[PDB]
Amino acid sequence: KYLKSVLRELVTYLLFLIVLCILTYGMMSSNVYYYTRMMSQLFLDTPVSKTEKTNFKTLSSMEDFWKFTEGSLLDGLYWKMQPSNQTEADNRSFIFYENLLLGVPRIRQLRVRNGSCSIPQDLRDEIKECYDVYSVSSEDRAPFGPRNGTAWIYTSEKDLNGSSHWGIIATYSGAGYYLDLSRTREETAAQVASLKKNVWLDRGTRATFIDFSVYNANINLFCVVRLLVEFPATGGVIPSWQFQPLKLIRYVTTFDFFLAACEIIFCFFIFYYVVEEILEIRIHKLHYFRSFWNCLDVVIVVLSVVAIGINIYRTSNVEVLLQFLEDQNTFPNFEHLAYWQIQFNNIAAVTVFFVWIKLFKFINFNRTMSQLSTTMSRCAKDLFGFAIMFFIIFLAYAQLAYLVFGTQVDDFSTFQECIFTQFRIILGDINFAEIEEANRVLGPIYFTTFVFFMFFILLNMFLAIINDTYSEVKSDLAQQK
Amino acid sequence: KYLKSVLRELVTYLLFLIVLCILTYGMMSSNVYYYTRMMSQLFLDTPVSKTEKTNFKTLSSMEDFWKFTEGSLLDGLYWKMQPSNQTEADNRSFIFYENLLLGVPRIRQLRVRNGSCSIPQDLRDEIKECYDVYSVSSEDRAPFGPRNGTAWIYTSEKDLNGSSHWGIIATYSGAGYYLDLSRTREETAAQVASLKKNVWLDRGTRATFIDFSVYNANINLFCVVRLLVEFPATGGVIPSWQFQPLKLIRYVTTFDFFLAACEIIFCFFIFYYVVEEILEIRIHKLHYFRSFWNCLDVVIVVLSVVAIGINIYRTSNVEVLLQFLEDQNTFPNFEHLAYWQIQFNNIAAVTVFFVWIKLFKFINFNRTMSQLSTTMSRCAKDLFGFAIMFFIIFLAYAQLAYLVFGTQVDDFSTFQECIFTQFRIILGDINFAEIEEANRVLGPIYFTTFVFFMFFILLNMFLAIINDTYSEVKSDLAQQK
Amino acid sequence: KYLKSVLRELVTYLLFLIVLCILTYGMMSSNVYYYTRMMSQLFLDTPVSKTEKTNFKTLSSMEDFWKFTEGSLLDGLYWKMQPSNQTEADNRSFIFYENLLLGVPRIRQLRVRNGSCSIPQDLRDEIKECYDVYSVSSEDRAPFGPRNGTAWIYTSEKDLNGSSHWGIIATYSGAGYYLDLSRTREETAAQVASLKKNVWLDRGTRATFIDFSVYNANINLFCVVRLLVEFPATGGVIPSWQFQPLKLIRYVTTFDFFLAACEIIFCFFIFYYVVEEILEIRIHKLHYFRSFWNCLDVVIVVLSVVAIGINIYRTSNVEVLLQFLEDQNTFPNFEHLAYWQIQFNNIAAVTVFFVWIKLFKFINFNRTMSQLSTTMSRCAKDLFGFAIMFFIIFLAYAQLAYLVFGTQVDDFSTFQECIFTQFRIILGDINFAEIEEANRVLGPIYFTTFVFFMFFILLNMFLAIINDTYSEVKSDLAQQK
Amino acid sequence: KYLKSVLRELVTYLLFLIVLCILTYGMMSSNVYYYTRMMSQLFLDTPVSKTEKTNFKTLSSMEDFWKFTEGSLLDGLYWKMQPSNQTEADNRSFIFYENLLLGVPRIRQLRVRNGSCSIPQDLRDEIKECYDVYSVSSEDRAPFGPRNGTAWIYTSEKDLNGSSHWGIIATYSGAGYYLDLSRTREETAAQVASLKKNVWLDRGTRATFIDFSVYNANINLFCVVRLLVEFPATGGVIPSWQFQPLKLIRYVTTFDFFLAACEIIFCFFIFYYVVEEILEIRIHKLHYFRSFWNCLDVVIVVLSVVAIGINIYRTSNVEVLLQFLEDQNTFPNFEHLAYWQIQFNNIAAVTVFFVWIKLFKFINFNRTMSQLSTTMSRCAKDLFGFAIMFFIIFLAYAQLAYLVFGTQVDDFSTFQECIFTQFRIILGDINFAEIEEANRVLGPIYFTTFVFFMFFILLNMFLAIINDTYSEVKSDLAQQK
Numbered sequence A, B, C, D: 001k002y003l004k005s006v007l008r009e010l011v012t013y014l015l016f017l018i019v020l021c022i023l024t025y026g027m028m029s030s031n032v033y034y035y036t037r038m039m040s041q042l043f044l045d046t047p048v049s050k051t052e053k054t055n056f057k058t059l060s061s062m063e064d065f066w067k068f069t070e071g072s073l074l075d076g077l078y079w080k081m082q083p084s085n086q087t088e089a090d091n092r093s094f095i096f097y098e099n100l101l102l103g104v105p106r107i108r109q110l111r112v113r114n115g116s117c118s119i120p121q122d123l124r125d126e127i128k129e130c131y132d133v134y135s136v137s138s139e140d141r142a143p144f145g146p147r148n149g150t151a152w153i154y155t156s157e158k159d160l161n162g163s164s165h166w167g168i169i170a171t172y173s174g175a176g177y178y179l180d181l182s183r184t185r186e187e188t189a190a191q192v193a194s195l196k197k198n199v200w201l202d203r204g205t206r207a208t209f210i211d212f213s214v215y216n217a218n219i220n221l222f223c224v225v226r227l228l229v230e231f232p233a234t235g236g237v238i239p240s241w242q243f244q245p246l247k248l249i250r251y252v253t254t255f256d257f258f259l260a261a262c263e264i265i266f267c268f269f270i271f272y273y274v275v276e277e278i279l280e281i282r283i284h285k286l287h288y289f290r291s292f293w294n295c296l297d298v299v300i301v302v303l304s305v306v307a308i309g310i311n312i313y314r315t316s317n318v319e320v321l322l323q324f325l326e327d328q329n330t331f332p333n334f335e336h337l338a339y340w341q342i343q344f345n346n347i348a349a350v351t352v353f354f355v356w357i358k359l360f361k362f363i364n365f366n367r368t369m370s371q372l373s374t375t376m377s378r379c380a381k382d383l384f385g386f387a388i389m390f391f392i393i394f395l396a397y398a399q400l401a402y403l404v405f406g407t408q409v410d411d412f413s414t415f416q417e418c419i420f421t422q423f424r425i426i427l428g429d430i431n432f433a434e435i436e437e438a439n440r441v442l443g444p445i446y447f448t449t450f451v452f453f454m455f456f457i458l459l460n461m462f463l464a465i466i467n468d469t470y471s472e473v474k475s476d477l478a479q480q481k
């Protein structure tokens, strides 16, 4: 009867569900974190460069930034090897021990043109210069300083093979200038001095990139490093960093022939429900119409295919075209080739999420629960459209926050970051130490009221409007009895 | 029909709402924070002055305070420029790079007269001296020390152009004495030594101000600095600081002619509803009477006008009268001219808040929500007058806290600060580390009971008295069905 | 009618309530905290004694303890004065500036007798010595070391004028030995060297006290210092400290003649309701019987009288008998004379607490609230006797905690401290960082379950059993309608 | 009547309950913690070895690990004695003062064989070497380096008397190599240099153990030390530590003859209910069937017996066979002999837990509570089987977390650790500082939704489905009235 068509479609998913759980552990090993954490804490937190305590994370002046380069990464990457002996002049070194350095770092940068901003008429004698915020129309393509080599010659975004980048305050694209690093300590050390001497950080500097990347021999894993040091147009500094691990070559002779052969099974397996599912979509137009459970049944397929192509289609031929392209003393473009990885990694996962809530309807046939799932199903039609009312007053304080503290407390800063903090307080966590220090009459009265209302309103609408309906429907499933 | 008069009044507000959202982003840029954070962490947290770790925030002795002045700000403000060359003897320098120093710092101070307090009769031989807490009748106008220059000559509050100030423990007004700083490092460095040598910090010193201010060339922004170092009458020290950014000249040739021309639209736009709304106020006396929604409809106008004048009326002619007044080597009074800014900034924002809850009644016409808004509308008549009962027992622990821990734990300190902590614990956050260390039999028994009752009473009254009414009214809107 | 007898009794309390609110602010000023915080952070957190970072709070070895004495307090108390000149050989100094040192410190100590514990028979050759935990029957009165001066001669508890003390692990009484400090730096510095040389800290040392005290000239306030450094019988060290501020002389010529004259009014005012209230107690035996509101009406009087005598009766004649007793170069006993202050301070406050909940019944006559106070009045008869059921399972985890983590995590430590942590987690706060590090299979499974049940049981019993009754009684006050 | 058989069985448990409460305090004293905390903070947090701040907990490089051994523990264990005199050449020393060192430390280690992993074909010329993750089939038994002494000769797991170990990433068994330490500072110091010189840490090193142990003369307590320093296969380092206190000799002449004589009473007392309880189990098969209260009545016995034997049966003859076995200059195996202690300690406690909830049914006969216990008894039949639905969506985010942040934030790391964090956030505690820094578009949207749903779903199902039933049953016990 049905049970054959019940389990058969289940048996697919029931078997299909284990497939990805393999990929999880399989495509990404569990200790991968302790790869970063090391690789992280090497180049971030640990200047001994002097008694100076300030690490990468804590940084202000530009000259420190110099002392950072030539004082840490310069000693981070370029330095001796395990035996100290046996004369390696071809691969001269890597960091230490179990990780391989490949290529050579690339320093990328932006700048904005002189007098891009007109000082108000009054001060025009008082001070000569102005450099305003970074923007496309404000970007500077003009050649610069003593013009020799690359970093003294502007280049187009498309000229380099690199892409744009997100960043925190201002998004950046292409390069104003760049310098690829030498593979030897000395010359790298030799440039930086010769590099500082010309001072291309003078003013108006905005984006500053440092890009190298490395390989792990042991578990094969392949990781990239982008250090972006922003400069606000107001004179400060914002440090930031991005560490992305990646597996490049898809084939590990041990476990992958199980995985990759199951990989092709996966894209085949969905190809089944690709067409199988559309048949009801084309044949029954309104039968699937107006079902949230069903309206979500498509999304899993929507996303999966996106993942499907981009891995092979985008990134497979990539992997090929780097062989000697990637290995030579020259530095590859590889970053953008991993751009999709992050793009992929999450959207790989996001699907996996929904895959469970698929089973949510199915294999719970048993108790009154199956009915008592309709209970929770009933509520939202009130609340799903209701939550605005709260969320309206919820944005209230949010925007009330920005305008008030936004110039002093950090946590609020933008509006996009300060929307969260008024969550993080509801669960609780506290900058309230320095809220007073911000504005004595306000920070109290904002906070005091907010925790009062929001934490005593969330009570109100939710719980009751939760409570009632269930009491009704559980009594309603009693009033069919 | 109505829909014409419905949308027309809406279209005003519906358009009016976007107007201010412009001002928000427009009148204050988003990165303004990263202006302070730099400008902050320069003069606060970062002595290298010796291996001494203690920054401004962590400070005790008076001689450190000296080592602070001549050791940090002295090197904070007065120091070299980007090229190090090209001979600037007119503007000799600013801090670094992208921020301009203007004027010159001013050190302001208070003191209290000798023997202002009568030691009890017994000890009168034991010790000679007494200086009691700062207060007006206890203030000292008497000339002091070797009398030369300004800071050895008292001045009246009105004599100087400055105003009073809030501060934490004691509010302060005017000046006992003052010294304007030199614009050169050396002479500033030269004074302080000559300044210490006379030791005008001897004892009884209470308020100590340091005031300079600076300008930002790049985005035009104009910021002021008040460092107040209090001295308790018990011998300690309280550091504190105030950083206020400001835009002064109202005209940025780029975006402002959009903003300022929309500014005049704004004050015009309210002028519409200024009179339009009073017509019903004068004609219908009792028709608007007794409506909370309507009773709040006035407040938005009440505040806005306050903001309206004070910006132009108070502060516009200000901006004018500083041109060469502000630029010359002499230091301006500008602080009070920004006093209203903070006064303004918030009260600008507070309105914006209410502007949303205006729409709260209007554009939700749709679901039973519009009715289900009457639900939440029903509750408070019980609770709004009820919340005292809690709040009564709520102050209980509060005042129970002060009398008990108030002499040992900091967090409680005053009553005004300790009213909050018994919130900050309900959401949760913890000094409970050192609560035991305060009083072993109490700190437990206060805390233990409090979290018990308050966190199990807030349950009680709220949720039920929330729950019921909705169950009734939702059934009442069912019992009109 | 009643309103005359209604307000008259009220007018007493209604006026009486303000009386104590004066005492609060009056008997204890608001800035008193910033007295300690200074006076605290001088002798606790701030060795510069070398580059060694370890302060008082962080301490291990005994020799550090030596370097603490002679390296900090030795420089804490004994050191120069404001002018550095004018030859004070009578009062040679105080700390700095605004606080007076009086008397001279006293070092007090305990020790336990040799071989107080019998090592098991096997090891008896392996190692010679044993010293067990401190206890009365294990206490050592035997004279000790080279016997000269005080600290080499035992003394009885009663011989010294001092009392016992609480402390954390073991309570202590009297003295094994003691040394009063010199008033001069040098000799104090001279002893300690001569003191170390004899090494009376050898082993078995348990309690170590350091006691001096100081006076504040300015606001008159009088503070005492007890530093107890425990030694566990296992070789460690436990630092601890006690700072008690006090006002001694009851008369400040300015504000006290208002306060003290109102003080005598207070003890008179209660003397009114002392007898006035007993009349109904004697005449009506069962009329007051079985009323919680009334059953609490006595407690306020119970405690107040306790406070009444002990201030004058215990501590007034004290204040007198210290005049030249307290001032002379010899050190007074004053500590115990302040013992009652803390004993008093709280029990002064605890009353004040209840004084509000007195008004709780009275001046709320108005809304249905007065009836709706009976609502909350109804609940507890279920819950007040119920809370055991939870509290039973609540102790469960508590004692489950001790036996499990108690030997590794600090936070649990005793049972008396670990009863709190399972609150502090419910509100939330976290050692959960090192819970895993303690026991990997447990710390999770304890924690995981606990937050599950306890935080999902507190839901259960409370809210519903809260909700229902009110829904009933509010409907019951509706069913009298 | 019943009351005789009611109390008699009670009187057993009612008396039995106190028995174990003795064991708690008795078998483990309260200050035992302050034994560890000292003994802990000696060898963990406190290098002065140079100005280098990095302690054991904060560690990266291998050479630091060397500087750790020879720089801390080398000075931790081996160093002078109280008198500095009286010539102890037999027991040469212990740490300090009140703790005895016995035996001598043992360094244990693992390694993995060369070329255990085949580098992909392409790079095979690029780099020569590979060492993959530790596993049994990947373990290396091959002899190593210059082969002399123990640590240059492999040994089997069974050859040594030691057992395997848990550890965090990889579990370890037996030894690749080992070296017992000398009892003298010098020779221990002498080896390490000679030890480093051979460099047996070269690469592929995984597990590194250091094992010594010590005795406490004073309270008799006997503690063991295992320091495991893991090496990831990716080049990092993971420090970790295990401190286990233990009492070995069961007889303390003072209090134990009360305890141990009550110990034999205990195992006798259960032997009563061992058989007494089985009689109803054999005679009534279905009468006990299907009672949760009764279904739990067996577990207490199930576990207790497990504890019963293993203490005497496993560990008693152990204690005997160490007398001169344990004392001699040679180092004993004692660790595994304490392996059961931890195994025992918890499972000793876990029983004690359930012992209370035994009384939960009994001595509450009194109020409607006894009936109102059936109320809470009613709920779970809905919820106990329900909690999956939540817990399903609960794992959702959990696994959604791993795949997303798992490569950057530490807190998530494995799946087994990241299941907790989504609790620790619900109660609240925050890495949300660096969540943004991980993935800007995700970390918000994960977090934002999660706190929304999970914290607004836990509301939903729980409270109502809690509320209703009680309202029904309390009305149902009213509808039997």
Ligand SMILES: N[C@@H](CC1CCCCC1)[C@@H](O)CC(=O)O
Pocket (backbone or CB within 6 Å): A017, A018, A020, A021, A022, A023, A025, A026
């Ligand atoms: N077999 C997978 C584990 C899960 C799949 C879902 C059903 C339960 C078992 C697999 O992920 C196991 C692993 O990767 O180690």
Ligand SMILES: N[C@@H](CC1CCCCC1)[C@@H](O)CC(=O)O
Pocket (backbone or CB within 6 Å): B017, B018, B020, B021, B022, B023, B025, B026
């Ligand atoms: N136009 C404003 C954005 C909001 C206004 C309210 C309606 C939705 C859109 C403006 O603030 C946009 C900006 O300042 O960038």
Ligand SMILES: N[C@@H](CC1CCCCC1)[C@@H](O)CC(=O)O
Pocket (backbone or CB within 6 Å): C017, C018, C020, C021, C022, C023, C025, C026
């Ligand atoms: N008059 C007191 C303030 C309170 C008393 C209670 C009624 C309201 C006013 C007094 O404490 C004021 C003061 O001490 O400053």
Ligand SMILES: N[C@@H](CC1CCCCC1)[C@@H](O)CC(=O)O
Pocket (backbone or CB within 6 Å): D017, D018, D020, D021, D022, D023, D025, D026
């Ligand atoms: N006699 C035990 C105390 C408890 C037992 C249970 C009933 C209440 C009293 C014993 O643990 C006391 C002690 O160990 O100090």
Ligand SMILES: *[C@@H]1O[C@H](CO)[C@@H](O)[C@H](O)[C@H]1NC(C)=O
Pocket (backbone or CB within 6 Å): A145, A146, A147, A148, A149, A152
């Ligand atoms: C170009 O290279 C020469 C080589 O010495 C160097 O001196 C010069 O600085 C470079 N470019 C400029 C603009 O100086």
Ligand SMILES: *[C@@H]1O[C@H](CO)[C@@H](O)[C@H](O)[C@H]1NC(C)=O
Pocket (backbone or CB within 6 Å): B145, B146, B147, B148, B149, B152
């Ligand atoms: C006044 O100026 C002179 C100039 O040298 C200086 O010496 C003196 O200290 C100043 N005033 C006093 C009171 O000393």
Ligand SMILES: *[C@@H]1O[C@H](CO)[C@@H](O)[C@H](O)[C@H]1NC(C)=O
Pocket (backbone or CB within 6 Å): C145, C146, C147, C148, C149, C152
């Ligand atoms: C007693 O005083 C003398 C004075 O020099 C001192 O040497 C001695 O140490 C003191 N007591 C003992 C036991 O040494």
Ligand SMILES: *[C@@H]1O[C@H](CO)[C@@H](O)[C@H](O)[C@H]1NC(C)=O
Pocket (backbone or CB within 6 Å): D145, D146, D147, D148, D149, D152
């Ligand atoms: C064996 O012992 C000798 C003794 O000096 C030492 O030199 C040698 O290093 C040891 N083993 C090896 C492999 O070197």
Ligand SMILES: [Ca+2]
Pocket (backbone or CB within 6 Å): none
């Ligand atoms: Ca909560």
Ligand SMILES: [Ca+2]
Pocket (backbone or CB within 6 Å): A427, A428, B427, B428, C427, C428, D427, D428
């Ligand atoms: Ca919380």
Ligand SMILES: [Ca+2]
Pocket (backbone or CB within 6 Å): A429, B429, C429, D429
């Ligand atoms: Ca916290």
Ligand SMILES: [Ca+2]
Pocket (backbone or CB within 6 Å): none
């Ligand atoms: Ca809640």
Ligand SMILES: [Ca+2]
Pocket (backbone or CB within 6 Å): A467, B467, C467, D467
């Ligand atoms: Ca209900």
